Subunit: 249 residues, 4 copies
């Protein structure tokens, strides 16, 4: 019988590509989503047509708050409700916007940027571990963590904490047979609304191909880390950036 | 006139050593504390006896919350109130206890560990910068890439603190504000003390609070005016020891 | 036409695992070896028995010297000689022994340890790129930052291999050549090592209290050479079962 | 008596600043140089004018070769023969020039770049330790080692190896009371170089949009050898004005 995976922020872009590739490998999937209800319902529908009852949706705000621990518990619970097991967790959902040091109040930005990128991944890891073969967690990190976007401190802080969690949980969940890893994109799928001239600026910086990663190319690294070809890999963060992080100012 | 420094969690231990050494260098100091009210007022008394009106205390909880941004703005305000300037911020205060993945609720654990180690440092950096040899020193951890078992939340916080150090160094550079870090390995029963001390290659002993303070003192000095975004490890070679 | 790979130090252990894996993926392989003549030809025969004209050996010392640049060019020329192409280079050959700060002369020790681990990979990368799904995989070390006591030269060589991996990824990207690394923690332990000492290194590993089979190392190599890694360059994948994460 | 220090490549620039500042702190100094004879002797005179018998020169090529171990041994010996002690070693000398992957032969380029940046520091460390207060070594590294200059593989390999040595010798010499540390400049004293190309690197630096003076680099070395660093070993301090933090 088929294994089961939870992907957070799976309605669009990289998340969707991961969910589709897991499903194409034979996984049953939980499509978590926040605002993108149409895209998530559509994806589940697409996957369920391919193979009956192998996909479900689950909505949750992953912003840090008093109810976040129960919300994360419920995301993991929904995988057990649907498929009776939870083998894989992909922490993909992420808030990304500038928070300059010099509409939203700063406490809200903290909650969103640190909640989505670090706290929720931790709380979901807790529930995954507590609710338990080839078990693994893959955390979507950032290849540019040590060369951050200007005025993106809280985002960068969340992504840094996520590296911390990847390492801490790898160590702690190793005795339980749970591997914990990361995939770190540099520049992948850029916003559709972003001018092509602006997209090009980031594209011209990538040594390998002068272009951004596809969502599928990121998913390819996730599939590897969850596979049997990685049964000894834990606490590792695989960069998928085409050399971007190696380019100086 | 004398420059002013804010040191969080400065009532005891490493924070006390940092406040004292900054004071001995000529800084007027704000001794932030949380629960150690007695020790902070005692330290403020000691420093003021040496030089009149060069030390004040400032109580604040640095657990994460919706009021934390205003608690951090007040700490900086308290430095301008007492001394009319704020040249140095030392982010020393830190919650440290295990949080295994498998009567403190997890929401509280997250609030205290991420709050003290990361979010409070961030908000203080904000208020510090907004109010302006200016520099910030963040007390990091030499063992962040080799963490204590079951310390995910503490380690997540210290990792974020690295992220802040580097992001704030880049962003506050055009303002002349340098942002740096000091990362202790083993610093401040007997058998467990002995166990950690034996692991340190250099002298098989822990760092004295003053040795850590020495690294803070270098980073705020004129001898470090081109240094920003650097984290100086003060660990006696501990991080270099394999399992 | 089937692609061709060069694997250095492929007569035994991890190198053989990588060579066999590539061959099973349909690669034609140059089995480079130093002393282990019998083992290399024995692997060559076994791979040729499965598919005709798909494996050859290549003897070469990779100790640092003035002739080493020529020796590296020849390893690469040898892949073109046999297969008319060279698509993949795996820098695996490695000297590993202590060199205490406080019997081989120190210049010999420098030549072998920096030679095999750093300079030879640099020279082979040179020759690989000159002679042109192209990629290079370098066998690194997960413990480069918590090194074995008294292994300064070996560690310096491994650190230099990281420098090379990143430098060459940057420089050979516009040419379509990807450069990546695989960093084992404890994998296949020395033949000379007794079972008591082996278990000591085994017990350090969080993930299964065991070393990586040569096959598990090769799996990481095969990923990086495959089309599943077309955007991955300058990446060093730890395959250490979380060993590097464990403090003293 | 006054402590003694060896500074390699001390005739001008950063090396000179370190020697001048160490001497200013109360150190007697061995000024090592390769080609800058007039500059080293000139510095020796200047420092000896300030305090009699506190400065000497020592000439050596630090290019890797069979005679390099003996060369490094004699550099350390020049400190003992003149001052009776050797308390500090600053590994500052360095070859730096492009070595593209695609009339100096490559074997020479390897010898010069890996020799000066990695192997000579290793052999000097060996000699320093074996010949043995406040004993420490400072290795001059590079803040941009993980975002290296294009076509500078050999130089970057050498600097990566120097990190390796700094960390390896830190662990191994810790029981002997010898501390091993690093100072990593970003853009410091140029080149000469085109002023247009100089200002291009300057504008990249977040802190001040300027390069570090040699004095500012020396400040970090002085800190590392000072009593204010008695617990610091295996640490590499960046003096880069934030340069290493700036994305492409
Ligand atoms: N794209 C890149 O170039 C790039 C570069 C570096 C790193 N990464 C990392 O790779 C991952 C995927 O990249 P991406 O660009 O595809 O991500 P993304 O579009 O920016 O975000 C992925 C999903 O996160 C969810 N999300 C945002 N805020 C949330 C909240 N408060 N609560 C619950 N969910 C929330 C959103 O779900 P809904 O749409 O349903 O609201 C969104 O679809 C991310 O973790 C990112 O940090 C990407
Ligand atoms: N000691 C080591 O071996 C070591 C190792 C690695 C890193 N570090 C780092 O170096 C720094 C100093 O070390 P340390 O051992 O001296 O630290 P510590 O004693 O454990 O904590 C220092 C101070 O933090 C304050 N604090 C705790 N929770 C707080 C809260 N919720 N709100 C406001 N303040 C709070 C406390 O203030 P009150 O007493 O007034 O309540 C305490 O005096 C810390 O950041 C630590 O993480 C230390
Ligand atoms: N095994 C581990 O636990 C571990 C840990 C960290 C890193 N690694 C890295 O992973 C790779 C594979 O490990 P391994 O244990 O399988 O390696 P290994 O057996 O120790 O070495 C592989 C081969 O290197 C060749 N070699 C040695 N000196 C040479 C020279 N001067 N010139 C040409 N070839 C020379 C030898 O070939 P001949 O026998 O034909 O003479 C040897 O068979 C190595 O690069 C190693 O450094 C391994
Ligand atoms: N300058 C920067 O922006 C920068 C940036 C990053 C790192 N660094 C590092 O900081 C240190 C000082 O920088 P720098 O710019 O002052 O260095 P540098 O001027 O380029 O070189 C310093 C000295 O190295 C000596 N040297 C070169 N080849 C030698 C050889 N084969 N044998 C013996 N000595 C040799 C030369 O001595 P002679 O003049 O007597 O021939 C030279 O004066 C270097 O290690 C450098 O790599 C500097
Ligand atoms: C370039 C980019 N990076 C992102 C990042 N780093 N993290 C998240 N969550 N989302 C991102 N989306 C875009 C804007 C496409
Ligand atoms: C022994 C020890 N004590 C610590 C302490 N007291 N406080 C912090 N923050 N971190 C510590 N880390 C170790 C090295 C595990
Ligand atoms: C026990 C051991 N053996 C090794 C070996 N045989 N070959 C290499 N290259 N590196 C090694 N390092 C460790 C994992 C410490
Ligand atoms: C930019 C530069 N970098 C150098 C470096 N990193 N190392 C050495 N030895 N020399 C250098 N010279 C100049 C041209 C000043």
């Amino acid at each position: 019988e088929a294994p089961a995976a939870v992907v957070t922020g799976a309605a669009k872009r990289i998340g969707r590509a991961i969910a589709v590739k897991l499903h194409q490998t034979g996984y049953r999937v939980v499509i978590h989503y926040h605002n993108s209800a149409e895209a998530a319902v559509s994806l589940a529908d697409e996957l369920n047509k391919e193979r009956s009852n192998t996909a479900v949706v689950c909505q949750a705000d992953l912003t840090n708050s008093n109810v976040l621990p129960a919300s994360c518990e419920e995301i993991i619970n929904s995988c057990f409700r649907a498929f009776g097991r939870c083998d894989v967790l992909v922490n993909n959902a992420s808030a990304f916007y500038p928070t300059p040091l010099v509409g939203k109040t700063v406490e809200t930005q903290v909650a969103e940027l640190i909640g989505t990128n670090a706290i929720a991944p931790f709380l979901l890891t807790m529930s995954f571990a507590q609710r338990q073969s080839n078990l693994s967690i893959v955390n979507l990190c950032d290849a540019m963590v040590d060369q951050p976007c200007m005025a993106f401190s809280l985002y960068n802080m969340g992504k840094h904490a996520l590296v911390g969690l990847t390492q801490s949980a790898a160590l702690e969940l190793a005795p339980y047979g749970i591997r914990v890893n990361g995939v770190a994109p540099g520049v992948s799928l850029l916003p559709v609304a972003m001018g092509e001239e602006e997209k090009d600026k980031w594209r011209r910086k990538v040594p390998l191909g002068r272009r951004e990663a596809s969502a599928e190319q990121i998913a390819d690294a996730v599939i590897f880390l969850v596979s049997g070809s990685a049964q000894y890999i834990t606490g590792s963060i695989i960069k998928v950036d085409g050399g971007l992080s190696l380019v100086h100012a």
